Amino acid sequence: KVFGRCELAAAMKRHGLDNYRGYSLGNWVCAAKFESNFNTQATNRNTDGSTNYGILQINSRWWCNDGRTPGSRNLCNIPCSALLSSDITASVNCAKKIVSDGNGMNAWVAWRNRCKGTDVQAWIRGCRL
Ligand SMILES: [Cl-]
Ligand SMILES: [Cl-]
Ligand SMILES: [Cl-]
Ligand SMILES: [Cl-]
Ligand code: NA
């Protein structure tokens, strides 16, 4: 599924991401924009052989099982395919664990490079939320 901007903000708010670990909703929308262009089916292979999955491009090295990442962990206890669903619950629940891991949203390199310090509230402006 390719979400609309305000549609994702609304879904993310419902699943409890708004201000989760101090990160306003716009940070999460921005992160998803640049990770996946709001497409739940986004996948991208990493140089190390791991793969990134879903709207927030969660990686198989640590967080999900895809059966093809030697030596990796599955800390969200899910198949990486669950991160591709039109239903964002698995992605949100795993994002919550990742953002709690010590480095906050810096865990998402694109959030740090493209969202961090910017007017992130712009990503939710005009939305009924
Ligand atoms: Cl947009
Ligand atoms: Cl915001
Ligand atoms: Cl594996
Ligand atoms: Cl933080
Ligand atoms: Na894994």
Swiss-Prot record:
The keyword DNA damage does not apply. Keywords: Allergen, Antimicrobial, Bacteriolytic enzyme, Disulfide bond, Glycosidase, Hydrolase, Secreted, Signal. InterPro entries: Glyco_hydro_22, Glyco_hydro_22_CS, Glyco_hydro_22_lys, Lysozyme-like_dom_sf. SUPFAM superfamilies: Lysozyme-like. The active site is at residues 35, 52. PROSITE patterns: GLYCOSYL_HYDROL_F22_1 (PS00128), GLYCOSYL_HYDROL_F22_2 (PS51348). GO terms for biological process: cell wall macromolecule catabolic process; defense response to bacterium; defense response to Gram-negative bacterium; defense response to Gram-positive bacterium; killing of cells of another organism. Disulfide bonds join 6-127, 30-115, 64-80, 76-94. It holds the Pfam family Lys. One of its GO terms (cellular component) is cytoplasm. GO terms for molecular function: beta-N-acetylglucosaminidase activity; identical protein binding; lysozyme activity. Substrate binds at residue 101. It is found in: Secreted. Its EC number is 3.2.1.17. It catalyses: Hydrolysis of (1->4)-beta-linkages between N-acetylmuramic acid and N-acetyl-D-glucosamine residues in a peptidoglycan and between N-acetyl-D-glucosamine residues in chitodextrins. SMART domains: LYZ1. Lysozyme C is capable of both hydrolysis and transglycosylation; it also shows a slight esterase activity. It acts rapidly on both peptide-substituted and unsubstituted peptidoglycan, and slowly on chitin oligosaccharides. Monomer. Belongs to the glycosyl hydrolase 22 family. This is Lysozyme C. It comes from Gallus gallus.
